[PDB]
Amino acid sequence: GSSGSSGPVLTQTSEQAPSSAPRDVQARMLSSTTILVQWKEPEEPNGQIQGYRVYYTMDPTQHVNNWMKHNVADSQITTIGNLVPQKTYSVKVLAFTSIGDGPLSSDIQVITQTGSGPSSG
Numbered sequence: 536g537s538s539g540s541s542g543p544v545l546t547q548t549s550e551q552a553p554s555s556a557p558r559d560v561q562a563r564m565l566s567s568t569t570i571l572v573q574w575k576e577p578e579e580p581n582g583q584i585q586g587y588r589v590y591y592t593m594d595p596t597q598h599v600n601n602w603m604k605h606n607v608a609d610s611q612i613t614t615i616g617n618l619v620p621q622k623t624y625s626v627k628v629l630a631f632t633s634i635g636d637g638p639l640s641s642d643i644q645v646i647t648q649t650g651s652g653p654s655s656g
Contacts, residue, residue, distance in 0.1 A: 551581045553577050555578045558577070561574075565614075624645055625644055
């Protein structure tokens, strides 16, 4: 019972590409060669989200366009494995819609090491 669609020709009605980076982007190790990437939807979707794009590679020194990259279908969560322990790995996430693509998020770095729980000291 909310008011929003009174009649035709509204004050504003145009869905564009996502102009907001993904949040809650954090990578938590679960195994010796198995990670977990989870994030939340953007703040300014401006349209129905079709999915997302992830970027992870042992050699981040190269362009993200050359990175291994991953696939996503509106899951807000992806588990990557078959990696190497004791090795720094880069991870990135972004949002894209039928209109276009959106800006990436703050580049993060997670090391492949076993261990869970709250950090001490």
